[PDB]
């Protein structure tokens, strides 16, 4: 066993908003070609990502992110 | 915080730039219509349509979706006309004027409460209890119910509101459960034993399904407590805010209905409402393309000054009062005469029977974005 690393912190989020085993979502997956997030799945996932990060992301640099990845850089890199 | 304070300036910087403003606030993308003639423009072009607050197909709030999408705020052709005309009846200025005496009644009963206090909180000691008083009255809400029914208003205010949250929709579905099964059993009774009121009305009938008229009670009832409130609050504190004016209306009461008209574009208890573009559409020079969110910022387009010269002076003398507080087009306020009359009557009566009205003196803004609702308005009197 271990701590919850950022990835899986931010898979367990995006699986647990969109219904989605934490495992079957892949870095590379789109939000929402791939997984299937409407217009009130992206919102709610970036609040959450909020919470869950203790961070404030604007408008702009949450449109650039369309893959879980990007979304693992952003945290990463703030 | 600093933005609730004073939204105006805002609004002022977005004018600025384009009076339909291009940009993205709390996460949602879309055109920022400050402009009064493009709002107005916007709101009378049925091709800017309606639209579920939630995304159409969204299942994680299937109750609270449910009731939403039913209500005619949120309906197009030709479902809106149906549901609006049906409602009607009970929002006819002549309908409207009956209610008067009721309101008089409630309005001397509410202030015998507090009379000898010296002290009062506006919302909680009198806005809130008129407007909820009036409005279950003409559903047809019992008095038993009437605390319940507030509940449920304050919790689905939230959830179309830019402010809203996974919690706050969470809890907007727990209360649409419960409103919806009690306007249903209440339905039950007055199929059984109609009586004269609103959900009687709407039974009678061209026709309404038993869940169209139970989630147009739960609309009606939303709007008769939350924006009625804050116009009577508003008003209030606006009046107190500027004494020469207050004085003007103590000595004059006729200047009432001018009075409240002004405070209604000043502090424009509602602060948003928004359309999506059903094709490309050219306005303004800019182009709205299919799909896109449009907002339209009533207390924004409220402060143009090409239509109010000097608007942000708080002027009771205004006259006409163009404002669009009350919206504009197919969907402009169902009760607006209501609204007007119960803030007219609460005002005036208050002025007279408080001779020495005064603020308790820092003003709080509920949380919402959508709507301009003070927390609480304590006052000192007599
Ligand atoms: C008890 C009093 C009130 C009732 C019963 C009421 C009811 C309604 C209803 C049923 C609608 C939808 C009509 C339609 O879609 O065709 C509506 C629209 C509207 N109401 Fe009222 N309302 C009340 C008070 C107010 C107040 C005080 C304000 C703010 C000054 C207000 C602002 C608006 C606006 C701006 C719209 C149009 C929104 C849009 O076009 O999307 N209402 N009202
Ligand atoms: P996707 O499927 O592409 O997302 C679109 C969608 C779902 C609209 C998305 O949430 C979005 O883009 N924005 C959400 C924000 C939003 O549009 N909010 C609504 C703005 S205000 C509004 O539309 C009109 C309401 C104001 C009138 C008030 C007058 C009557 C008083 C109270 C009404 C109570 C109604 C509440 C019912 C529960
Ligand atoms: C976290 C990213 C989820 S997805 C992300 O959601 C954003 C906010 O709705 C949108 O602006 C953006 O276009 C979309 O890719
Ligand atoms: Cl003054």
């Not at chain 2, 309005?107 to 015998?112: A, G, R, T």
């Not at chain 2, 449920?152 to 969470?170: C, G």
């Not at chain 2, 020495?356 to 003003?363: H, P």
Request: charged letters at 25%; hydrophobic letters at 40%; a negative charge.
């Amino acid at each position: 066993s271990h701590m919850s690393t950022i990835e899986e912190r931010v898979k367990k989020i995006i699986g647990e908003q969109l219904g989605v085993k934490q495992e079957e979502v892949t870095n590379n997956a789109s939000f929402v070609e791939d997984l299937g997030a409407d217009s009130l799945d992206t919102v709610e996932l970036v609040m959450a990502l909020e919470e869950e990060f203790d961070t404030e992301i604007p408008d702009e640099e949450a449109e650039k992110i369309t893959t879980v990845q990007a979304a693992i850089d952003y945290i990463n890199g703030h | 915080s600093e933005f609730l304070k004073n939204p105006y300036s805002f609004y002022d910087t977005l004018r600025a730039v384009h009076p339909i403003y291009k940009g993205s606030f709390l996460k949602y993308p879309g055109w920022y219509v400050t402009g009064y003639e493009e709002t107005a423009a916007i709101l009378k072009d049925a091709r800017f349509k309606v639209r579920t607050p939630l995304p159409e197909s969204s299942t994680k709030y299937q109750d609270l979706s449910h009731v939403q999408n039913q209500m005619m705020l949120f309906q197009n052709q030709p479902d809106h006309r149906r549901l609006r005309t049906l409602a009607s009846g009970a929002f006819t200025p002549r309908t409207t004027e009956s209610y008067q005496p009721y309101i008089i009644e409630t309005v001397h009963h509410l202030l015998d409460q507090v009379q000898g206090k010296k002290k009062m909180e506006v919302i909680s000691d009198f806005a809130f209890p008129l407007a909820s008083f009036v409005i279950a009255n003409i559903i047809g809400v019992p008095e038993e119910d009437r605390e319940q029914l507030k509940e449920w208003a304050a919790s689905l205010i939230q959830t179309i509101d830019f402010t809203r949250s996974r919690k706050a929709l969470t809890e907007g579905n727990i209360m649409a459960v419960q409103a919806m099964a009690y306007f249903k059993e209440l339905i039950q009774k007055r199929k059984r034993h109609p009586q004269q009121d609103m959900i009687s009305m709407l039974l009678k009938g061209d026709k309404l399904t038993e869940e169209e008229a139970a989630s147009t009670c739960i609309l009606l009832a939303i709007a008769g407590h939350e924006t009625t409130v804050n116009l009577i609050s508003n008003s209030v504190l606006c009046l107190l805010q500027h004494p020469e004016q207050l004085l003007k209306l103590r000595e004059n009461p006729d200047l009432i209905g001018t009075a409240v008209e002004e405070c209604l574009r000043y502090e424009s208890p509602t602060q948003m409402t928004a359309r999506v573009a059903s094709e490309d559409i050219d306005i303004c020079g800019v182009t709205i393309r299919q799909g896109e969110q449009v907002y339209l910022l009533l207390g924004a387009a409220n402060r143009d000054p090409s239509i109010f010269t000097n608007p942000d002076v708080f002027d009771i003398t205004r006259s006409p009062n163009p404002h669009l507080s009350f919206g504009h087009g197919h969907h402009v306020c169902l009760g607006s005469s209501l609204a007007r009359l119960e803030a007219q009557i609460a005002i005036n009566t208050l002025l007279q029977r408080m001779p020495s009205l005064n603020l308790a003196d820092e003003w709080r803004y509920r949380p919402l974005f959508g709507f301009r609702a003070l927390e609480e308005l304590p006052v000192t009197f007599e």
